[PDB]
RNA sequence: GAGUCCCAUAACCUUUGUACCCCAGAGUGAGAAA
RNA sequence: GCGAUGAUCUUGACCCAUCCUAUAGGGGGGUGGGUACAAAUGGCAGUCUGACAAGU
């Protein structure tokens, strides 16, 4: 998909799959495209991971629009089943938002990976 | 509720029981983005210095800002068609703004506002080939820039020496992070002012507009051929 | 001693800048780029303007944003090509396609700056506001359609289409009741027996 | 402008004041919105019509943003028809369900 | 000798004057997608819709005779048809706008012949009222009273109106 | 899991404008003008 | 050269003027307030929850 614009690679995709694993471990992420847009609407989500594998990709790429309108980071990993196993349900997951509280036990790596996303915009 | 004029006719202060900044209307009826209309009869549109970037530069102010109500304005700019409405509201029907954006995700809303506002000329090629949009423009009297993709100075340099006239004026919102993160504000800003005066645009003023948005200054410059 | 090509509103404007084929390219700002001075230097020669139609606008858009292959551009090319004179070319990407023709094509950016600043005063004779109106018309007409997809599947019309549905149903119910009352004054029975509006 | 919407909103894009008042008093929300007048949720019978209202909202969001943000789609309704067959066999396999015993 | 024609005749024509104003405004905002410039130059509803039925697509280009027959201002509209260009096309199904504008034309031409009908009907039913106060105020009076006999049996002080 | 159809096509209120009138009002009943 | 075929009739608050005591107040210049209608990217006004279900 040439229209899946920010797509990761091995190091940063491994880091974001690790941090989404720890976020699902303490259970403060949201799983699903419309739930990701709900979090984008109510401003809760720290950033968005999406899957540059969905058929067609326009089921997913609407939330980039309001995501950059609300200036949130948003990344593509190249496999929906990979980040589904990352988020810890048994289903192919198309998008996942990661919420925010400041008492979080993964706060510093969340901030590190979101600066890593913003380094490629 | 009383209207105060700035140095530039087109930017006013609606102050009174609430105090804020407004512009004129080149289109009556309604706020095209969802702000309040001050009524005096005469209508006045708020524009938020957060959701705009030139508006907070008016909250910075200038000895001579090159937007005047006869001064033809070019707007390379960010792709959103938000602030070009108020550049139109400043310039009135005698001047004209040419807004040039490439990514057509706000190109459609730009076309939508510019249909009901004949003050705006929408150019929908890239911001890097004025040789390609020659025939839709002639000898603009000012340029404004809000491009974030990192060859800001070189590409507004090419636009400013192709279309902006002699002894005209440039006004740029120079970003820090969108060209160079990890290096500080005044460093990358003085680097940009260095390459501008290398391109013989005489700089006049930079200021960071801090509480409205973080670490993006505006620089302004006289042009010298 | 030169002719220059510049596309202005829908056209190819050959402007005659009476100076040398090399010195007008060379000095070009010590040539006193003033209104009367460059107006007397760059005099009006030709303006191959096709029409104000959108098809001529499409020919102009293909000649501008891509290399010059317009038939109107060829017709303007067969209007001063008899001496291999200095025909100042405008675009830099449509320069090899300009050179692919039997002509003598040629800071020239600055003479185009001067030509552009003294075009709407006198050089076609046309109006400042009319040139800006034709330019904004061109931009709203065919620049957005040649970059973007279309506007044939535009969706803003369907809102007033369905508003016409709802208001036509409401208004037609009121007309039905008024006709049933008026002809019921001649026939008070049949509105009970055929309640259908259009059958009434 | 409705392509950038969650499918929950497209489940409830008509029953606005009923939804908001059933929030306001601590009461129970509606389940249809405007979508109740669709043929599939008409064909469903019970509260599984609310369930198929949810799944039709989801597949409508899918098909809706497909033909909204597509740039070259075939004007044919292919994945719309595919999702229609999906919700149709979903509907039959939930109308096979009956909570009363046999 | 029957005012039951006249009361619902006037209560019919004021309502249809309202909705032909509504439908002419809808024709205006629909044809703004084809002529966003014509709406300020030709403001009149009936002549507007009658020339919208005339010029379908922006292809006038040659004459002024038929445009003035629908009407100089014609010539300005003719030039602005090629200079405006803030306009879409939608020509393959603009024929519904062509049928709709002539539908407003047929409605507004049913009006004024209904108005001629009740001018005759107030000249025949209440001729003293039509001669003294006019047909419009006469029909409004007997409607606002309820009927002719009720208006008559009203006393002279309760002929108050708004 | 989860109250649409009480009409969000909305209902009310405000603002904009528009042709408007600014008097008692099951109006009072015999005076005005010199 | 009047009128039961209808005479008459109590006006929401004040800024320079025409009148009564070189400049200052009280009795046809200036004006608020409200009544019968169309529009709003005006306000009320906020766009449900999110992994289990079913059968053997």
UniProtKB/Swiss-Prot annotation, chain A:
- Report the principal subcellular site: nucleus
Which residue ranges traverse the bilayer? none
Give the similarity note.
Answer: Belongs to the eukaryotic ribosomal protein eL8 family.
Does DNA damage show up as a keyword for this record? Answer: no
Cellular component per GO, a single term: nucleus
Q: Which GO terms describe its molecular function?
A: RNA binding; U3 snoRNA binding; U4 snRNA binding
Mutagenesis or variant effect for residue 80 to A: Impairs binding to U4 snRNA, but not U3 snoRNA, and causes pre rRNA processing defects and an accumulation of unspliced U3 snoRNA
Q: How does it assemble?
A: Binds to the C'/D and B/C motifs in U3 snoRNA. Component of the U4/U6-U5 tri-snRNP complex composed of the U4, U6 and U5 snRNAs and at least PRP3, PRP4, PRP6, PRP8, PRP18, PRP31, PRP38, SNU13, SNU23, SNU66, SNU114, SPP381, SMB1, SMD1, SMD2, SMD3, SMX2, SMX3, LSM2, LSM3, LSM4, LSM5, LSM6, LSM7, LSM8, BRR2 and DIB1. Binds to the 5'-stem-loop of U4 snRNA. Component of the ribosomal small subunit (SSU) processome composed of at least 40 protein subunits and snoRNA U3.
Q: Name one GO biological process term.
A: box C/D sno(s)RNA 3'-end processing
> Keywords for this entry?
mRNA processing, mRNA splicing, Nucleus, Ribonucleoprotein, Ribosome biogenesis, RNA-binding, rRNA processing, Spliceosome
Instruction: Tell me the PROSITE patterns matching this sequence.
Output: RIBOSOMAL_L7AE
Listed SUPFAM superfamilies? L30e-like
Q: What is this protein called?
A: 13 kDa ribonucleoprotein-associated protein
Give the location in the cell: Nucleus, Nucleolus
InterPro entries linked: eL8/uL1-like (IPR050257), H/ACA_rnp_Nhp2-like (IPR002415), Ribosomal_eL30-like_sf (IPR029064), Ribosomal_eL8-like_CS (IPR004037), Ribosomal_eL8/eL30/eS12/Gad45 (IPR004038), Ribosomal_eL8/Nhp2 (IPR018492)
Swiss-Prot record, chain B:
What does the UniProt entry say about where the protein is found? Answer: Nucleus, Nucleolus
Region: Helical; residue ranges are 184-216
Protein family membership: Belongs to the methyltransferase superfamily. Fibrillarin family.
Recorded protein name is: rRNA 2'-O-methyltransferase fibrillarin
Catalytic activity annotation: L-glutaminyl-[histone H2A] + S-adenosyl-L-methionine = N(5)-methyl-L-glutaminyl-[histone H2A] + S-adenosyl-L-homocysteine + H(+); a ribonucleotide in rRNA + S-adenosyl-L-methionine = a 2'-O-methylribonucleotide in rRNA + S-adenosyl-L-homocysteine + H(+)
User: What are the UniProt keywords, alphabetically?
Assistant: Isopeptide bond, Methylation, Methyltransferase, Nucleus, Ribonucleoprotein, Ribosome biogenesis, RNA-binding, rRNA processing, S-adenosyl-L-methionine, Transferase, Ubl conjugation
Q: In terms of one coarse class, where is the protein primarily found?
A: nucleus
The task this protein performs is described as: S-adenosyl-L-methionine-dependent methyltransferase that has the ability to methylate both RNAs and proteins. Involved in pre-rRNA processing by catalyzing the site-specific 2'-hydroxyl methylation of ribose moieties in pre-ribosomal RNA. Site specificity is provided by a guide RNA that base pairs with the substrate. Methylation occurs at a characteristic distance from the sequence involved in base pairing with the guide RNA. Involved in the biogenesis of the 18S rRNA.
The highest taxon in the source lineage is: Eukaryota
Highest classification ranks of the organism: Eukaryota, Fungi, Dikarya, Ascomycota, Saccharomycotina
Portion of the full-length sequence here: 86 to 322 of 327
Q: What is its EC number?
A: 2.1.1.-
Note down the stretches annotated as region S-adenosyl-L-methionine binding: 82-83, 101-102, 126-127, 146-149
- Locate residues linked as Glycyl lysine isopeptide (Lys-Gly) (interchain with G-Cter in ubiquitin): 53
Q: Name one GO biological process term.
A: rRNA 2'-O-methylation
Keyword Cell cycle in the entry? The reply is no
User: Which is an annotated GO molecular function term of this record?
Assistant: RNA binding
- Which top EC class applies here? transferase
From Swiss-Prot, chain D:
Species source reads: Saccharomyces cerevisiae (strain ATCC 204508 / S288c)
Gene for this chain: NOP58
Q: How does it assemble?
A: Interacts with SIK1/NOP56 and NOP1. Interacts with the trimethylguanosine synthase TGS1. Component of the ribosomal small subunit (SSU) processome composed of at least 40 protein subunits and snoRNA U3.
The name under which this protein is listed is Nucleolar protein 58
Q: Where in the cell is it found?
A: Nucleus, Nucleolus
What are the top taxonomic ranks of the organism? Eukaryota, Fungi, Dikarya, Ascomycota, Saccharomycotina
Role of this protein? Required for pre-18S rRNA processing. May bind microtubules.
Q: Which family does it belong to?
A: Belongs to the NOP5/NOP56 family.
Nop domain span: 1-96
**What else does the entry mention about this protein?**
Present with 34700 molecules/cell in log phase SD medium.
Swiss-Prot record, chain E:
Q: Which residues form a coiled coil?
A: none
Q: Which residues carry this modification: Phosphoserine?
A: 147
Its localization reads: Nucleus, Nucleolus
The subunit structure is: Interacts with NOP1 and NOP58. Component of the ribosomal small subunit (SSU) processome composed of at least 40 protein subunits and snoRNA U3.
Q: Which family does it belong to?
A: Belongs to the NOP5/NOP56 family.
Note in the entry: Present with 13500 molecules/cell in log phase SD medium.
- Described purpose of this protein according to its UniProt entry: Required for 60S ribosomal subunit synthesis.
**In its UniProt entry, what is this protein called?**
Nucleolar protein 56
* The species this protein was found in: Saccharomyces cerevisiae (strain ATCC 204508 / S288c) (Baker's yeast)
Q: Which residues of the full protein are shown?
A: 169 to 336 of 504
């Amino acid at each position: 998909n040439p229209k899946a614009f920010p797509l990761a690679d091995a190091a940063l995709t491994q880091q974001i799959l690790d941090v989404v694993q720890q976020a699902a471990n303490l259970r403060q992420l949201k799983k699903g495209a419309n739930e990701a847009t709900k979090t984008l609407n109510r401003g809760i989500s720290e950033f968005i991971i999406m899957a540059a594998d969905c058929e067609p990709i326009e089921i997913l790429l609407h939330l980039p629009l309001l995501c950059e309108d609300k200036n949130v980071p948003y990344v593509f990993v190249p496999s929906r089943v990979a980040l589904g196993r990352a988020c810890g349900v048994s289903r192919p997951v198309i998008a996942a938002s990661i919420t925010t509280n400041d008492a979080s036990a993964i706060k510093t790596q969340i901030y590190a990976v979101k600066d890593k996303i913003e380094t490629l915009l | 509720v009383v209207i105060e004029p700035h140095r530039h006719a087109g930017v006013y202060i609606a102050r009174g029981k609430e105090d804020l900044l407004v512009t004129k209307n080149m289109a009556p009826g309604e706020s095209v983005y969802g702000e309040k209309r001050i009524s005096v009869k005469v209508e006045y549109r708020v524009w938020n210095p957060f959701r705009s970037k030139l508006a907070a530069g008016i909250m910075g102010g200038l000895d001579e800002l090159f937007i005047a109500p006869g001064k033809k304005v070019l707007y390379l700019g960010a792709a959103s068609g938000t602030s070009v409405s108020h550049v139109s509201d400043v310039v009135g029907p005698e001047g004209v703004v040419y807004a040039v954006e490439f990514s057509h995700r706000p190109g459609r809303e730009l076309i939508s506002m510019a249909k009901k506002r004949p003050n705006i000329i929408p150019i929908i090629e890239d911001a890097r080939h004025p040789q390609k949009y020659r025939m839709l423009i002639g000898m603009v009297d000012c340029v404004f820039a809000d491009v974030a993709q990192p060859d800001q100075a070189r590409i507004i340099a090419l636009n400013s020496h192709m279309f902006l006239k002699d002894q005209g004026g440039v006004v740029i919102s120079i970003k820090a992070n969108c060209i160079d993160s990890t290096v500080d504000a005044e460093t990358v800003f003085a680097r940009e002012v260095q390459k501008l005066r290398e391109e013989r645009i005489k700089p006049l003023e930079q200021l960071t507009l801090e509480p409205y948005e973080r670490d993006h200054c505006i620089v302004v410059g006289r042009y010298m051929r | 001693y030169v002719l220059t090509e510049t596309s202005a509103g829908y056209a190819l404007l050959k402007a005659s800048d009476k100076k040398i084929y090399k010195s007008s390219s060379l000095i070009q700002d010590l040539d006193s780029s003033d209104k009367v001075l460059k107006e007397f230097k760059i005099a009006a020669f030709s303006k191959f303007n096709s029409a104000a139609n959108a098809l001529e606008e499409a020919n102009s858009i293909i000649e501008g944003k891509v290399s010059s292959q317009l038939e109107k551009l060829l017709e303007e090319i067969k209007k001063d090509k008899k001496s291999t004179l200095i025909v100042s070319e405008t675009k830099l990407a449509n320069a090899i396609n300009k050179l692919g023709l039997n002509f003598n094509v040629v800071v020239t950016l600055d003479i185009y700056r001067a030509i552009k600043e003294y075009l709407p005063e006198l050089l076609p004779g046309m109006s400042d506001n009319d040139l800006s109106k034709m330019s904004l018309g061109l931009a709203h007409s065919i620049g957005r359609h040649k970059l973007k997809f279309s506007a044939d599947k535009v969706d803003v019309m369907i809102i007033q289409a369905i508003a016409l549905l709802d208001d036509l149903d409401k208004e037609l119910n009121t007309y039905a009741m008024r006709c049933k009352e008026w002809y019921g004054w001649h026939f008070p029975e049949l509105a009970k027996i055929v309640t259908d509006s259009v059958a009434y | 402008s409705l392509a950038k919407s969650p499918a929950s909103t497209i489940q409830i894009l008509g029953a606005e004041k009923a939804l908001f008042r059933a929030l306001k008093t601590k009461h129970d929300t509606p389940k249809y919105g405007l979508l109740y007048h669709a043929s599939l949720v008409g064909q469903a019978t019970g509260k599984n019509k609310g369930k198929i209202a949810r799944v039709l909202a989801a597949k409508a969001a899918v098909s809706l943003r497909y033909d909204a943000l597509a740039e070259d789609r075939d004007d044919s309704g292919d994945i719309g028809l595919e999702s229609r067959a999906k919700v149709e066999n979903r509907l039959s396999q939930l109308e096979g369900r009956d909570l009363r015993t046999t | 000798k029957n005012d039951n024609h006249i009361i619902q005749a006037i209560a019919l024509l004021d309502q249809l004057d309202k909705d032909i104003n509504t439908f002419a405004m809808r024709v205006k905002e629909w044809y703004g997608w084809h002529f966003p410039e014509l709406a300020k130059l030709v403001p009149d509803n009936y002549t507007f819709a009658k020339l919208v039925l005339f010029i379908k697509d922006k292809a006038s280009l040659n004459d002024d005779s038929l445009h003035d027959l629908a009407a100089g201002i014609a010539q300005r509209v003719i030039d602005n048809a090629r200079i405006s260009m803030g306009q879409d096309i939608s020509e393959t199904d603009m024929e519904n706008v062509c049928v709709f504008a002539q539908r407003v034309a047929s409605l507004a031409d049913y009006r004024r012949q209904l108005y001629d009908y009740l001018c005759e009907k107030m000249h025949t039913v209440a001729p003293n009222l039509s001669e003294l106060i006019g047909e419009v105020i006469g029909a409004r009076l007997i409607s606002h009273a309820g009927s002719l006999t009720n208006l008559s049996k009203q006393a002279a002080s309760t002929v108050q109106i708004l």
